[PDB]
Amino acid sequence: NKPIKNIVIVGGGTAGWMAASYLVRALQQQANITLIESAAIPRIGVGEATIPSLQKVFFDFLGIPEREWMPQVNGAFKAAIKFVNWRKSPDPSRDDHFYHLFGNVPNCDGVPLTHYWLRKREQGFQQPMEYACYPQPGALDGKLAPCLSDGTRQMSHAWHFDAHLVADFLKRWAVERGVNRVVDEVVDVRLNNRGYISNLLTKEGRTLEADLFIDCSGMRGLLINQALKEPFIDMSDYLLCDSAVASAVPNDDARDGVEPYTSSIAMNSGWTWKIPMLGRFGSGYVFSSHFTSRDQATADFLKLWGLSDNQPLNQIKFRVGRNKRAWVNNCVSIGLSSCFLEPLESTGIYFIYAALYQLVKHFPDTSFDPRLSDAFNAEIVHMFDDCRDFVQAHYFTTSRDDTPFWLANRHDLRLSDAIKEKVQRYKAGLPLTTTSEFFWLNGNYYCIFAGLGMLPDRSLPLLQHRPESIEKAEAMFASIRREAERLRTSLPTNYDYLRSLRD
Amino acid sequence: NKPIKNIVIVGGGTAGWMAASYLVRALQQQANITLIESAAIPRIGVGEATIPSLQKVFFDFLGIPEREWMPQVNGAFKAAIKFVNWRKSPDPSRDDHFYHLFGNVPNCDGVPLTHYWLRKREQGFQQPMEYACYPQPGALDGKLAPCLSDGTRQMSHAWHFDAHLVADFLKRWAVERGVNRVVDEVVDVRLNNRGYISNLLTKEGRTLEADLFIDCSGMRGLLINQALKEPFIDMSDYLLCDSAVASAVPNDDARDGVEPYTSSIAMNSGWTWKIPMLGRFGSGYVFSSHFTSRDQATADFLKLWGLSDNQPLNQIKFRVGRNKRAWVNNCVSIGLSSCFLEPLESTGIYFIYAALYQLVKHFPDTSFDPRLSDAFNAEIVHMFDDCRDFVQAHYFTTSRDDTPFWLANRHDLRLSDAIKEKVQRYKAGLPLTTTSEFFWLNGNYYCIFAGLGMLPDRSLPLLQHRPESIEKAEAMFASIRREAERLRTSLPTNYDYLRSLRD
Ligand SMILES: Cc1cc2c(cc1C)N(C[C@H](O)[C@H](O)[C@H](O)COP(=O)(O)OP(=O)(O)OC[C@H]1O[C@@H](n3cnc4c(N)ncnc43)[C@H](O)[C@@H]1O)c1[nH]c(=O)[nH]c(=O)c1N2
Ligand SMILES: Cc1cc2c(cc1C)N(C[C@H](O)[C@H](O)[C@H](O)COP(=O)(O)OP(=O)(O)OC[C@H]1O[C@@H](n3cnc4c(N)ncnc43)[C@H](O)[C@@H]1O)c1[nH]c(=O)[nH]c(=O)c1N2
């Protein structure tokens, strides 16, 4: 069976160039890659915060270290997501914030630290879960960097970057290693009787042909949805947000610093992201068209940052779900042409590079062994499904009841059987998945659940039997405090740290 | 023009019930008052120390004497604020305390006693300003009451009271005289095209209507800020504190006594109040989120009183400023829905009752004469502005430089032109405002300035010319010493005094 030799990618957004660079890297020989991108159809000018796997899976795979791509994409550090007003009905006079931090929680004698903490909360300990279990939340509060000045790593971190530049950086990178860039628009797609893709017909006259097609076309799914007719499984019964109003905002870095984290500020009918980088931050009120008009959400979005009705904006509509199948025949969808959830925990870019890893792990020849396509499709489903559990979990555990949208999340959602079982295990008091990557651990469910004020019914029956164990955990809590303390006096601010990679 | 007949107050905190009782008292006829208070939204469980005007303006207006409301609100006496460690970089082996006392300082031959004192400090007198100029600081040191046992008044005093009870005492008082209490929550507010308030829609179904609306809704400013869209002028450029961590603490009254004063203990990134009453005292580390994390300030707050990490706390966020306008259209804001500074000299409750006095002084009919609204707004601005001068003055005169927060106060503040001119007049050696209520006199600026160790450049050129005058002041200093002395052997302790109003 002839190998796959000519590859066409449709689209030059983030999904498009990640595919070109990844595929140009994985396919060391017999590979010919063309990416076509309509300059009439712009990129979705967002997608800016990330999870730690980006370096390990994407950039390391390319052979580009953090210090090389960060400066060139206005890169900044994300140590966590800070959740603001998700817990109770909001109150200006109350401090309703929790972090969701990266990195694992230690175990004491085979039981995670979260669980020794809860036994303490049961005796009237007051300190919230994350401040007790992780060394860094206080640092983030003080806007500290995740490294010492000299560059040594002091916490787990992910990144915030400018979406446009990220695309340009990889465009330069890819073209350079022989990727062939075509600026044209695809208008017709031709199938054969069997139902495969023989050719793309472009606006400027070109007929495009290849063994293999990557649909990186955005939510229009030009190849996968339209041409190939593959169903999109709508999932608004699971998660309600379907729209966003976004923009960049000036930051006075020199006086307010630059937060080393993403914020998610709960609103009336959605929530708003804050993604700081040097000079500015990206922000977006992700909302639900069912519960608020787009014009009302604009008003809320401007009201929240004191913007002016003169401020240019990015008005966005999004589809929530996954194609029945990510890869059909000789077409594979990567990015928004495939499955989205909502930006709440940055699972998007992750769906891109994780899919490309799976694509290469399942790479076909021209016979198109459907056993490879099936295996691939199943991994996409599981990755997507897992993520959906976790995002969904931010919503149905809420105590807020002050708006129709918060009522619905609390009440009206369709919940997988898998998220119900996890919730019920947490409610009985059992740790979730711990460790000593295929992903969301006890520590993650715990920050989220504990942050929204749904705690387990009790601490572990087992603990009554292991008093020494309890003591050892006391010591581990004591180290953590020491570490938190050292960091306070040792990290440079995030503003100052970033400022020196070249200003 | 029809008179105002139906009045709705939103909120049943301290601001809420002071308004109901004051308005039910002022409006002897044609007045119908309803107060709505969400049992889902609690009172800010603080606001406990006061200035002398409370009786004269608020309680006297109601016809309630001191001996009637004190016992019923765990009332205690405040003779001054004692400032601890504000002067130098702290030292356990040094006694860094000054009082700010109530009451005026006498004048000798038209020049205040503070100024004869300074001429003496210039010859190497050592006794600090307040111990020389006021008869009572030594009494307070010995925790003495401000009255003889039989009840005769021996100094100027204000009060400490339990916030919750104060609200309940006036709730009982008001309802009783025909105030109509509604336990519901306001969720929607309806305007007309002109921009007035036609109705409040509640959670339980009620549509509320009235000629006149008092926003006593807390910092959420439900009517004034949210519905009516009135701007809040943020003033963090003037004063930096924006948060507090508070709690009640057990006092062994029988052995440590009960201080007849508020303390303000300067911290790393704020300062802490102590408000003793029988059995217990209220305490709060007011701090700045910019300079310390909330979790660090908790640690400092527990470390300072030896509390346990089991101790329930009141975690508070506050906004510093004033609405562009306190009263817009047919809405008037009283209390935290209007302007706050920070608890440093108890200007808060004072803003409530002073505003209510001004409201009645400017009371409208249904035509809503904007000349009345304007006049009112201007008095609020002037009262608020005056207070802000005085609080701000505690901060920028500091000599401390041992933390970033003390550095900023010393350096980074925006200072009104009015406080600069007062400072410059004090620096030249001129008395500030003296007397023989619309408020902060020479004696007040003097305790504060002199306490922090910023003294004038010299004594008054005039004094070189009036040696007899100097002598007469010597005698006045001699009386004061006699009085201080008599008091030492005549006042009962504050514990013993309070103990008998009914135990
Ligand atoms: C509101 C919001 C917020 C976020 C996110 C999404 C949304 C909707 N994401 C997801 C992220 O934005 C997304 O995964 C990528 O940045 C962009 O993916 P694409 O390239 O699929 O789409 P996109 O729609 O950007 O690009 C489409 C490309 O296809 C081309 N094209 C389309 N039709 C064509 C045709 N007919 N012919 C030729 N070319 C054609 C266009 O020219 C363009 O080059 C995210 N993820 C994450 O991990 N963290 C985050 O914080 C966020 N934030
Ligand atoms: C940390 C700190 C410390 C101090 C002080 C403030 C702060 C922040 N103060 C100020 C003082 O606490 C304050 O002025 C009053 O005690 C409380 O004022 P309110 O009633 O505005 O607010 P508060 O927020 O207490 O009460 C709000 C009321 O509004 C109601 N409400 C809100 N929204 C509603 C809705 N939508 N529907 C129905 N009801 C609604 C609530 O149910 C509640 O009844 C003070 N002052 C002073 O003079 N000396 C001092 O020592 C101090 N100490």
Side-chain angles (χ1 to χ4, degrees), chain A residues 1 3-4 6-55 57-66 68-500 503, chain B residues 1 3-4 6-55 57-66 68-500 503:
Chain A
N1 309 294
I4 298 300
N6 312 319
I7 295 162
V8 156
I9 311 157
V10 170
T14 295
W17 291 103
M18 287 194 170
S21 28
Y22 198 91
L23 289 175
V24 81
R25 173 82 155 159
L27 296 189
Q28 287 302 296
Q29 302 289 345
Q30 309 162 75
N32 227 41
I33 310 183
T34 323
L35 183 154
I36 161 149
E37 45 148 312
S38 168
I41 320 199
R43 288 187 272 270
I44 208 151
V46 300
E48 296 202 320
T50 51
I51 62 188
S53 36
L54 173 80
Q55 182 72 44
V57 181
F58 183 76
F59 284 124
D60 281 354
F61 180 78
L62 301 174
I64 324 170
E66 209 166 314
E68 198 213 308
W69 68 265
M70 277 192 61
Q72 304 205 65
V73 297
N74 194 11
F77 296 103
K78 185 212 210 195
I81 303 191
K82 180 173 81 180
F83 286 85
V84 175
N85 301 354
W86 283 68
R87 204 199 171 112
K88 289 198 213 247
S89 248
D91 198 331
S93 58
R94 295 321 152 154
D95 189 4
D96 173 12
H97 87 263
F98 62 100
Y99 294 93
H100 164 210
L101 307 149
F102 286 131
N104 199 38
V105 155
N107 307 290
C108 175
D109 273 336
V111 166
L113 231 55
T114 47
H115 292 247
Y116 294 93
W117 170 86
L118 177 61
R119 193 215 56 114
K120 292 175 68 176
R121 194 183 212 54
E122 264 167 12
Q123 318 260 247
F125 201 65
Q126 296 298 304
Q127 202 202 20
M129 189 282 292
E130 85 274 29
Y131 284 85
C133 290
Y134 293 89
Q136 77 270 28
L140 304 190
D141 272 343
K143 293 172 198 163
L144 297 189
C147 302
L148 299 135
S149 305
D150 70 20
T152 353
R153 155 195 309 77
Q154 297 280 275
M155 45 191 82
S156 301
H157 50 104
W159 311 263
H160 302 143
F161 50 49
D162 180 320
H164 185 67
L165 305 186
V166 180
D168 287 357
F169 175 76
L170 303 162
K171 183 180 72 221
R172 261 189 313 288
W173 198 82
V175 143
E176 239 224 281
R177 273 162 205 75
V179 176
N180 260 282
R181 170 153 200 264
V182 172
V183 183
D184 196 359
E185 201 174 80
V186 189
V187 289
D188 287 323
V189 197
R190 279 70 156 278
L191 307 189
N192 54 28
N193 294 335
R194 303 205 306 107
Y196 280 60
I197 308 191
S198 344
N199 61 66
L200 310 172
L201 181 93
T202 70
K203 176 207 260 280
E204 255 176 3
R206 282 194 251 5
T207 304
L208 281 173
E209 283 180 321
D211 318 300
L212 177 70
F213 291 93
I214 316 308
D215 191 333
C216 286
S217 81
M219 317 162 188
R220 100 190 45 239
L222 183 79
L223 306 192
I224 204 84
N225 299 129
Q226 308 200 333
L228 274 179
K229 279 195 196 329
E230 184 79 356
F232 190 79
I233 301 187
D234 182 85
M235 280 160 204
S236 330
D237 50 344
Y238 286 82
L239 295 162
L240 315 154
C241 287
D242 59 12
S243 328
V245 52
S247 193
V249 185
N251 190 259
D252 177 14
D253 287 1
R255 232 194 32 200
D256 319 299
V258 167
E259 295 150 326
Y261 55 87
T262 288
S263 310
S264 148
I265 304 139
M267 308 285 284
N268 287 336
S269 294
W271 61 278
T272 290
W273 73 80
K274 175 158 174 211
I275 287 165
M277 46 223 152
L278 266 173
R280 81 242 271 92
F281 64 90
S283 187
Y285 174 12
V286 172
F287 67 95
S288 167
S289 64
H290 290 278
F291 291 96
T292 200
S293 70
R294 173 177 298 276
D295 210 73
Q296 154 83 154
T298 291
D300 295 356
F301 180 75
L302 308 170
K303 190 203 137 60
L304 173 80
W305 305 119
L307 302 175
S308 81
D309 9 303
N310 288 299
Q311 170 75 72
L313 312 175
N314 203 2
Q315 287 302 339
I316 308 183
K317 212 169 68 198
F318 64 93
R319 70 173 180 177
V320 181
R322 87 192 166 56
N323 298 318
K324 180 175 55 77
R325 281 183 304 189
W327 163 15
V328 186
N329 294 335
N330 59 333
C331 174
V332 194
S333 46
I334 293 309
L336 284 176
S337 60
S338 175
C339 63
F340 196 58
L341 254 14
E342 66 137 293
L344 182 55
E345 290 263 2
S346 306
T347 59
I349 293 151
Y350 163 75
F351 295 159
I352 297 152
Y353 59 76
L356 290 166
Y357 173 90
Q358 295 307 347
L359 173 53
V360 164
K361 286 301 148 135
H362 301 88
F363 199 74
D365 57 44
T366 57
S367 83
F368 278 95
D369 197 353
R371 294 180 289 185
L372 308 180
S373 76
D374 300 333
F376 173 90
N377 284 343
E379 309 278 10
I380 306 284
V381 169
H382 189 269
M383 157 208 86
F384 166 88
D385 275 5
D386 232 274
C387 281
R388 190 200 60 201
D389 282 3
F390 182 71
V391 170
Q392 198 173 21
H394 292 47
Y395 275 107
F396 72 72
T397 38
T398 182
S399 281
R400 298 188 50 169
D401 64 36
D402 45 312
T403 68
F405 165 95
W406 295 109
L407 287 182
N409 282 301
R410 206 166 165 251
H411 282 122
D412 294 346
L413 296 184
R414 174 185 175 198
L415 257 43
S416 78
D417 284 310
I419 184 66
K420 271 166 142 159
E421 197 187 53
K422 288 214 196 47
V423 157
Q424 142 182 321
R425 265 184 292 262
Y426 170 93
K427 275 182 155 144
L430 306 149
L432 291 182
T433 313
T434 64
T435 214
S436 280
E437 154 137 37
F438 253 57
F439 179 70
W440 298 114
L441 316 180
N442 177 79
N444 301 106
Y445 282 94
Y446 227 108
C447 289
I448 306 317
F449 285 151
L452 302 151
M454 187 217 51
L455 288 181
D457 292 351
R458 69 177 66 62
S459 72
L460 278 164
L462 179 68
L463 297 181
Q464 283 315 299
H465 282 111
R466 306 184 50 89
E468 305 159 13
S469 257
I470 273 157
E471 297 281 45
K472 179 153 142 170
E474 278 311 319
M476 304 191 47
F477 288 124
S479 290
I480 285 178
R481 192 145 255 208
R482 282 172 202 128
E483 203 194 337
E485 183 36 38
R486 175 169 70 267
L487 298 171
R488 210 195 91 254
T489 68
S490 319
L491 301 153
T493 66
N494 192 36
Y495 172 59
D496 284 346
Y497 191 62
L498 303 175
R499 259 217 290 162
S500 43
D503 226 294
Chain B
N1 309 294
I4 298 300
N6 312 319
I7 295 162
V8 156
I9 311 157
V10 170
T14 295
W17 291 103
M18 287 194 170
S21 28
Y22 198 91
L23 289 175
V24 81
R25 173 82 155 159
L27 296 189
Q28 287 302 296
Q29 302 289 345
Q30 309 162 75
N32 227 41
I33 310 183
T34 323
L35 183 154
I36 161 149
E37 45 148 312
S38 168
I41 320 199
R43 288 187 272 270
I44 208 151
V46 300
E48 296 202 320
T50 51
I51 62 188
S53 36
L54 173 80
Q55 182 72 44
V57 181
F58 183 76
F59 284 124
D60 281 354
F61 180 78
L62 301 174
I64 324 170
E66 209 166 314
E68 198 213 308
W69 68 265
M70 277 192 61
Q72 304 205 65
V73 297
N74 194 11
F77 296 103
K78 185 212 210 195
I81 303 191
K82 180 173 81 180
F83 286 85
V84 175
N85 301 354
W86 283 68
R87 204 199 171 112
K88 289 198 213 247
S89 248
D91 198 331
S93 58
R94 295 321 152 154
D95 189 4
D96 173 12
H97 87 263
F98 62 100
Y99 294 93
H100 164 210
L101 307 149
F102 286 131
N104 199 38
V105 155
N107 307 290
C108 175
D109 273 336
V111 166
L113 231 55
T114 47
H115 292 247
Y116 294 93
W117 170 86
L118 177 61
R119 193 215 56 114
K120 292 175 68 176
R121 194 183 212 54
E122 264 167 12
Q123 318 260 247
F125 201 65
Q126 296 298 304
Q127 202 202 20
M129 189 282 292
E130 85 274 29
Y131 284 85
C133 290
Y134 293 89
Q136 77 270 28
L140 304 190
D141 272 343
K143 293 172 198 163
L144 297 189
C147 302
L148 299 135
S149 305
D150 70 20
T152 353
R153 155 195 309 77
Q154 297 280 275
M155 45 191 82
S156 301
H157 50 104
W159 311 263
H160 302 143
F161 50 49
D162 180 320
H164 185 67
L165 305 186
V166 180
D168 287 357
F169 175 76
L170 303 162
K171 183 180 72 221
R172 261 189 313 288
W173 198 82
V175 143
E176 239 224 281
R177 273 162 205 75
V179 176
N180 260 282
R181 170 153 200 264
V182 172
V183 183
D184 196 359
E185 201 174 80
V186 189
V187 289
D188 287 323
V189 197
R190 279 70 156 278
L191 307 189
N192 54 28
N193 294 335
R194 303 205 306 107
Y196 280 60
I197 308 191
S198 344
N199 61 66
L200 310 172
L201 181 93
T202 70
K203 176 207 260 280
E204 255 176 3
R206 282 194 251 5
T207 304
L208 281 173
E209 283 180 321
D211 318 300
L212 177 70
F213 291 93
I214 316 308
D215 191 333
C216 286
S217 81
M219 317 162 188
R220 100 190 45 239
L222 183 79
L223 306 192
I224 204 84
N225 299 129
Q226 308 200 333
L228 274 179
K229 279 195 196 329
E230 184 79 356
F232 190 79
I233 301 187
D234 182 85
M235 280 160 204
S236 330
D237 50 344
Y238 286 82
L239 295 162
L240 315 154
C241 287
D242 59 12
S243 328
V245 52
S247 193
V249 185
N251 190 259
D252 177 14
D253 287 1
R255 232 194 32 200
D256 319 299
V258 167
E259 295 150 326
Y261 55 87
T262 288
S263 310
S264 148
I265 304 139
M267 308 285 284
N268 287 336
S269 294
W271 61 278
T272 290
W273 73 80
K274 175 158 174 211
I275 287 165
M277 46 223 152
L278 266 173
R280 81 242 271 92
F281 64 90
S283 187
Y285 174 12
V286 172
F287 67 95
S288 167
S289 64
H290 290 278
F291 291 96
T292 200
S293 70
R294 173 177 298 276
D295 210 73
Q296 154 83 154
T298 291
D300 295 356
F301 180 75
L302 308 170
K303 190 203 137 60
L304 173 80
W305 305 119
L307 302 175
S308 81
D309 9 303
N310 288 299
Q311 170 75 72
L313 312 175
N314 203 2
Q315 287 302 339
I316 308 183
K317 212 169 68 198
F318 64 93
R319 70 173 180 177
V320 181
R322 87 192 166 56
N323 298 318
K324 180 175 55 77
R325 281 183 304 189
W327 163 15
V328 186
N329 294 335
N330 59 333
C331 174
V332 194
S333 46
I334 293 309
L336 284 176
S337 60
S338 175
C339 63
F340 196 58
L341 254 14
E342 66 137 293
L344 182 55
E345 290 263 2
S346 306
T347 59
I349 293 151
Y350 163 75
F351 295 159
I352 297 152
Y353 59 76
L356 290 166
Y357 173 90
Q358 295 307 347
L359 173 53
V360 164
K361 286 301 148 135
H362 301 88
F363 199 74
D365 57 44
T366 57
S367 83
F368 278 95
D369 197 353
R371 294 180 289 185
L372 308 180
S373 76
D374 300 333
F376 173 90
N377 284 343
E379 309 278 10
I380 306 284
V381 169
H382 189 269
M383 157 208 86
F384 166 88
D385 275 5
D386 232 274
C387 281
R388 190 200 60 201
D389 282 3
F390 182 71
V391 170
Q392 198 173 21
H394 292 47
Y395 275 107
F396 72 72
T397 38
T398 182
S399 281
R400 298 188 50 169
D401 64 36
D402 45 312
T403 68
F405 165 95
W406 295 109
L407 287 182
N409 282 301
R410 206 166 165 251
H411 282 122
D412 294 346
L413 296 184
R414 174 185 175 198
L415 257 43
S416 78
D417 284 310
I419 184 66
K420 271 166 142 159
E421 197 187 53
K422 288 214 196 47
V423 157
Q424 142 182 321
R425 265 184 292 262
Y426 170 93
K427 275 182 155 144
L430 306 149
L432 291 182
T433 313
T434 64
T435 214
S436 280
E437 154 137 37
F438 253 57
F439 179 70
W440 298 114
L441 316 180
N442 177 79
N444 301 106
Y445 282 94
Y446 227 108
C447 289
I448 306 317
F449 285 151
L452 302 151
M454 187 217 51
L455 288 181
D457 292 351
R458 69 177 66 62
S459 72
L460 278 164
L462 179 68
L463 297 181
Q464 283 315 299
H465 282 111
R466 306 184 50 89
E468 305 159 13
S469 257
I470 273 157
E471 297 281 45
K472 179 153 142 170
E474 278 311 319
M476 304 191 47
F477 288 124
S479 290
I480 285 178
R481 192 145 255 208
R482 282 172 202 128
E483 203 194 337
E485 183 36 38
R486 175 169 70 267
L487 298 171
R488 210 195 91 254
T489 68
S490 319
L491 301 153
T493 66
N494 192 36
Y495 172 59
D496 284 346
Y497 191 62
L498 303 175
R499 259 217 290 162
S500 43
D503 226 294

